[PDB]
Amino acid sequence: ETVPVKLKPGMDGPKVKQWPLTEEKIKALVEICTEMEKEGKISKIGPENPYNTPVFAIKTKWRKLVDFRELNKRTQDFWEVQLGIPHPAGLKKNKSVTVLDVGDAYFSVPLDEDFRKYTAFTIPSINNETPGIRYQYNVLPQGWKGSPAIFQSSMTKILEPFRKQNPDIVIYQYMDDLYVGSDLEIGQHRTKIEELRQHLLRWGLTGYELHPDKWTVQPIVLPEKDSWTVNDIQKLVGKLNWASQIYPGIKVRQLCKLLRGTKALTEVIPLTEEAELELAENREILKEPVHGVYYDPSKDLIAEIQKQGQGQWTYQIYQEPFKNLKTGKYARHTNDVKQLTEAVQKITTESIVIWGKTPKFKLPIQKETWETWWTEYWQATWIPEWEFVNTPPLVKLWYQ
Amino acid sequence: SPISPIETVPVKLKPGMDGPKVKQWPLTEEKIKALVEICTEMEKEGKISKIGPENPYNTPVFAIKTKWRKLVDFRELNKRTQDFWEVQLGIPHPAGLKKNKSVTVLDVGDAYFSVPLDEDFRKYTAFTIPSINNETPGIRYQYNVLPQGWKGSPAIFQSSMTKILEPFRKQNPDIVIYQYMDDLYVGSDLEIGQHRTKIEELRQHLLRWGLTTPDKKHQKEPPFLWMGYELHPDKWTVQPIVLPEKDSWTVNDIQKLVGKLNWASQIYPGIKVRQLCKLLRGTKALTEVIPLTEEAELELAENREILKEPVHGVYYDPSKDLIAEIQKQGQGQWTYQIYQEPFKNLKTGKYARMRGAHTNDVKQLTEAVQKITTESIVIWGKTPKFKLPIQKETWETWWTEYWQATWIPEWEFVNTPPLVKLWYQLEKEPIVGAETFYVDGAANRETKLGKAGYVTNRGRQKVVTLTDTTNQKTELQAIYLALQDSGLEVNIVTDSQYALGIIQAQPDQSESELVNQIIEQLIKKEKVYLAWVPAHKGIGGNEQVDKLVSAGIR
Numbered sequence A: 001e002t003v004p005v006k007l008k009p010g011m012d013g014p015k016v017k018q019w020p021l022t023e024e025k026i027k028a029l030v031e032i033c034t035e036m037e038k039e040g041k042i043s044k045i046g047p048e049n050p051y052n053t054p055v056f057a058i059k060t061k062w063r064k065l066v067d068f069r070e071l072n073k074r075t076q077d078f079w080e081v082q083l084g085i086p087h088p089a090g091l092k093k094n095k096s097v098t099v100l101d102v103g104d105a106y107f108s109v110p111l112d113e114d115f116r117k118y119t120a121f122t123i124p125s126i127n128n129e130t131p132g133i134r135y136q137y138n139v140l141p142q143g144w145k146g147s148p149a150i151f152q153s154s155m156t157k158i159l160e161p162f163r164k165q166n167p168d169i170v171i172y173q174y175m176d177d178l179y180v181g182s183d184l185e186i187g188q189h190r191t192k193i194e195e196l197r198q199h200l201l202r203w204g205l206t207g208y209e210l211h212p213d214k215w216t217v218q219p220i221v222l223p224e225k226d227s228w229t230v231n232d233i234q235k236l237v238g239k240l241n242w243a244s245q246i247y248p249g250i251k252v253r254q255l256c257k258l259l260r261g262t263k264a265l266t267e268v269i270p271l272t273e274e275a276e277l278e279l280a281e282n283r284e285i286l287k288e289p290v291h292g293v294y295y296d297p298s299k300d301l302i303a304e305i306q307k308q309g310q311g312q313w314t315y316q317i318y319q320e321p322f323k324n325l326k327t328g329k330y331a332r333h334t335n336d337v338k339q340l341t342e343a344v345q346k347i348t349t350e351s352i353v354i355w356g357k358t359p360k361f362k363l364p365i366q367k368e369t370w371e372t373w374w375t376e377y378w379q380a381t382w383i384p385e386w387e388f389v390n391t392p393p394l395v396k397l398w399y400q
Numbered sequence B: 001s002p003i004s005p006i007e008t009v010p011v012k013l014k015p016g017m018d019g020p021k022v023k024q025w026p027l028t029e030e031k032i033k034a035l036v037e038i039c040t041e042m043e044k045e046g047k048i049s050k051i052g053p054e055n056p057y058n059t060p061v062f063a064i065k066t067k068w069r070k071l072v073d074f075r076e077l078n079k080r081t082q083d084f085w086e087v088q089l090g091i092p093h094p095a096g097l098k099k100n101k102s103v104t105v106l107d108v109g110d111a112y113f114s115v116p117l118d119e120d121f122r123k124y125t126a127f128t129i130p131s132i133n134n135e136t137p138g139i140r141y142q143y144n145v146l147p148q149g150w151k152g153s154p155a156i157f158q159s160s161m162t163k164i165l166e167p168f169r170k171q172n173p174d175i176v177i178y179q180y181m182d183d184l185y186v187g188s189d190l191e192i193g194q195h196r197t198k199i200e201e202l203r204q205h206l207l208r209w210g211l212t213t214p215d216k217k218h219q220k221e222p223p224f225l226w227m228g229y230e231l232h233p234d235k236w237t238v239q240p241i242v243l244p245e246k247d248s249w250t251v252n253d254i255q256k257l258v259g260k261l262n263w264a265s266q267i268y269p270g271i272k273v274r275q276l277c278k279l280l281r282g283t284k285a286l287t288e289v290i291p292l293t294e295e296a297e298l299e300l301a302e303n304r305e306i307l308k309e310p311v312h313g314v315y316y317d318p319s320k321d322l323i324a325e326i327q328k329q330g331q332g333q334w335t336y337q338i339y340q341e342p343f344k345n346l347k348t349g350k351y352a353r354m355r356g357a358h359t360n361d362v363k364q365l366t367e368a369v370q371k372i373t374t375e376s377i378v379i380w381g382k383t384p385k386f387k388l389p390i391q392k393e394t395w396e397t398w399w400t401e402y403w404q405a406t407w408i409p410e411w412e413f414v415n416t417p418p419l420v421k422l423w424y425q426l427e428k429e430p431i432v433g434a435e436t437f438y439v440d441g442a443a444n445r446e447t448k449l450g451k452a453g454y455v456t457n458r459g460r461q462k463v464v465t466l467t468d469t470t471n472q473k474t475e476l477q478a479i480y481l482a483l484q485d486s487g488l489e490v491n492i493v494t495d496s497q498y499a500l501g502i503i504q505a506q507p508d509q510s511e512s513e514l515v516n517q518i519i520e521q522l523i524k525k526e527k528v529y530l531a532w533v534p535a536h537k538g539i540g541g542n543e544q545v546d547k548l549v550s551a552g553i554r
């Protein structure tokens, strides 16, 4: 018995263009889809289905990735409020969190007949030889936020003996993945994951290891200097001027005093003691969390990334600009696009662990280069929302 | 003519909408007679069927002229019919075609009329031949087949042709079949005999499903004229391009010239269109004569020379890699050629784009690489190997220091001048024994009057008044002043992120003449260090320029 799925009123299904795919990805998808069809998971469709969702291939085995971003936004009432999955606050406090792919579970649950048309996707051909190969889903699709929402009840039943036997193990389902946390020693943790895989293995379903307790802030670092130049104080005042827009209690009055008259940039200007007091007092505030900043569940999360050079990237997560919920850094035969996708995926997984939702990314790359290359390195089964931004020149050095 | 026994495509109207009920306008006797003759003939062929008066839907009919044709106005029905999936997401490019031993063109005869319409949807296609004047009830018909001018026809036909071709495709994987509108383009590497036989097997499989195709004597011979292209057995080209000789060029003639040159640009290398396009800038009428500028005349002449002798492209060999070569032509103009075997181009193209107001050759080159990469994935399903007029060192220096994630796939330097370079570079640290200029600009929002100036550590000073200005313009003007009065080495301190931002990206070309003047200065300089400070915080020299430029302004 299929659960009926109703779209958000006033808006209809997704009509998103399929991106050009290489020959190897097309052939990989044709092979996958021929197989799913024989198994009745998907069916070939007619032209009377005007809907479309993009499809991609990722990795040694090729796997299908359906971009349900638009369908998910259009079904938000269903998966978020109607059939919401509660996020545990304890997960971010665990010594180890193991991420397990549980997407194969969804293929055993039939999709509501009157919702299937909205899961439409096309396999394109090279040089437009043939019209695309069109399919729709007959079962809960991987990548659609409604799939874990519907499967919720079956997941609870599967995990019930395990949860009863392990009361201090946190299990969170987000999209196609299970997040399993414990404060156990690494060996005992890995032993309990194998036990859970055995439980999953009895219902069909078949890792990636995080350490959230070791996740720490990227404080705005103020230099430690032997001798300070006019240029160094100027760099320091701008950096402090901006940190004061986010942190309660920052002061620059004493440091600003030093900058009197029109001086040469290289002039070594001997420091004071009250200026030294400011530095140390600001340093103290900079290492601690931001006072008065709390996550609002009704608001979207934003992630900002800056290229810092030498394979280093900085990022900030916020809901209101300046108001940082989390800051961090990512460090690397790796290119900028490969480094950027790795950072996006790392920031998303931390965001899932901490808030139970993905951020919208502000990416310092050209829309087109990102659109051509992102899949070459993408490894997750989810895709966050993203925008293309032109990184302001000073945000970079203030986060350096 | 047959009507395919294929399964019908279920069609629906848009939710909350009923079929059309649009009144038939009284027709002339000659029009009524013409329609009656047309309709009785289509009814006998199975195309339409007579209906009772119980059906409340109606679409208007018209007839136009020794033969007459029936025009059905499906505008109302089309507005009420559901949306269909897009027919094709692109059109095949000749350069993506592989060379086959034999290829034949099969056009399907009376395509839409050869495929049935959803029985439950036929009622909405109802039309009336009016009787002479008001008088008596009209003759009523509904369609049994896909009507011409109906929304769903292109999609339903294509979908029907796909379901039909399916079993034939499975049992013949070494046969290429292109689906284009009501045509089939069929290619194989079999010797004449078994190709002619496979064509007959195809034709016969098609007739079993209601579709008629031409036979050996009626089927077209190469070169195939198709979509402005010429497809020969060993090469392809664009159809003849004739650039008119005119005494006076109108907007319409220039627009037609640009379209022709753009079309030729796919296979003829070096085609330029920048100077011809510039003429189309402004509020100018279709028939308004535009005098050709010197540059437009020069560009026209260069193009006539390129087009003088015929140029062809070759077909794709899937075993070889694709090589893409790019050259800088000038004023934001780039040109490229794609080949597999040195100098036998599969295709050519051009790139010219203003991606912002301020740019450089390094950014333009990456934009052209991305545009070519996209195109290769569409045409060939693979990215090409690039040969670029930029040194690995220039690229490495640029990618490393730029704020944006930028990447070029597998490439090699090729010494084809003009080479792509960075014209200047900003210092990383303040210069010792160089004058520090503190710059500022201020502009009054009501009067649009502004001031640009500088105070130095060497006690120097200047203030210039500006008339129809903006804060941004004054801040850039202030940087220009400092650059003009400094000599070989400078340290500049601005409170403008906007100005800092532009200069840091190392532009070499701009839409702003002021930015171009700043550029021509930066190039001349030996060393420039540019720094930023927050405004109105009482910072050193910044507070001093602020008072100077603010006087009589803010």
Ligand SMILES: NCc1cc(Cl)cc(Oc2c(Cl)ccc3c2nnn3Cc2[nH]nc3ncccc23)c1Cl
Pocket (backbone or CB within 6 Å): B092, B093, B097, B098, B099, B100, B101, B102, B103, B104, B105, B176, B177, B178, B185, B186, B187, B222, B223, B224, B225, B226, B231, B232, B233, B234, B315
């Ligand atoms: N209707 C245009 C048309 C458009 C499209 Cl997009 C495809 C078409 O059909 C071809 C096929 Cl099926 C295969 C190779 C082709 C084709 N066309 N050119 N070449 C390369 C080629 N190989 N061998 C040839 N022999 C003769 C002519 C071209 C030849 C046709 Cl005719």
